[model samples]
Target chain A: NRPNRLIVDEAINEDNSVVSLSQPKMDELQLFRGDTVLLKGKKRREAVCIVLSDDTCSDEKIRMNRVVRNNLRVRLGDVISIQPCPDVKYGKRIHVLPIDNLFEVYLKPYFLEAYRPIRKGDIFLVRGGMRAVEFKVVETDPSPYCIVAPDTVIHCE
Target chain B: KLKVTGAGINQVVTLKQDATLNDLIEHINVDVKTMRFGYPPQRINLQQTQLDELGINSGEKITIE
Candidate 1:
């Protein structure tokens, strides 16, 4: 039985760091609420996201925002696989660069004590003032994935 | 379990169902002379108080300074 594969669906509530799964599907997968999970999409692309339960979500569908979809390189209704990712460590430091040249006044306040998890090579969008800017995770201290903790130095360029 | 973060620390710690704030602090490997809390940051000072009494949940994040 294929247990990890699910169809992608549009998110009801758009959040870059979150995806929604049916409560029953989560139970079947033995996934805990608010825990990080690794999603595998086409072209060897992967993204890490927090999984939340949505009663309205169908068991065969996973709801995710456009940011995650773009990172995963998947379109609506595309099939993807998901599994637990419990070993992501706290970061020592991370280096990020905005696709469109972009700041402590931006990045610092956005991640300041936010505890958001980031994976190397993943792209995420942040909203500051007039428009949202996209940044790519160039490097992670612990590699692959790590939670951005208070002490973790963020080097942005 | 609680996600505790501070100047040079970031890790999760598990506690007994009836664990108190002091007990949670004791589990931390770092020195936490002062502690803060979640959204709309607030200071935490009660040590002997049970975490449940302080509205702290198992997966809640606690920031220390």
Candidate 2:
């Protein structure tokens, strides 16, 4: 499958991490399903957004590949600032395992708002291939981590 | 929704939506300096109240918390 998401830009970034994205016509309500988002500080990462309660994007934590639950070094229900990873690449390609943080860093943040509310399975193309799963958001924090919904999450199931 | 058709030096993205929210990501047609895996999914988070106020019926023009 091919990537079918889009981008939107209309916010501010105080940090120098993201300078700007080449694409300028990004919509605020528009959602993407890729793994890398170009941040305000010009930093592209695997970050996700739940809500704008703080008017701040989560810190770029996984700057050093702190992906998934392992490298990120955090447990469930825990809050840690991070920049999710880009997902156009497959997990088993470079290695047999789906890239670390395959769920959190790569897929969660970008499209949380779309899937969290609806518990429906999505058919998407990852890395130019068809991704099979019932990926959907099953919960919400009203903001941050909305992409990380569905409690159990889509963990290579 | 009003789209800033013109491009500015430093463009800004606003997430102003108040819906039940979910795990959807956004895709931009461009290459970056670096990439993880292949690309990262853009995520969004909004409140049910925000979704209603801005008239975000199906989650668009919304931002994350």
Indicate which candidate wins on DockQ.
Answer: 1
Residue pairs with backbone atoms closer than 3 Å in model 1 (clashes)? none
lDDT of each: 0.80, 0.26
TM-score of chain B of 2: 0.17
Listed per model, the TM-scores of chain A against the true chain A are 0.93, 0.19
Top-TM-score candidate index: 1
The list of candidate 2 runs beyond 4 A from truth reads: A1-67, A82-94, A97-157, B1-65
lDDT of 1 by residue, A53-95 (tens): 7899999999999989999999999999999775677899999
TM-score of each: 0.73, 0.19
Model 2, A1-157: lDDT tens digits are 1121222222353221121222211223242222123222212212332222112322212121112222223333333332332221112111112321455544554334332211112122122124422222222233222233334234442
Model 1 segments more than 4 A misplaced: B1-65
Residue-level lDDT for A126 in candidate 2: 25
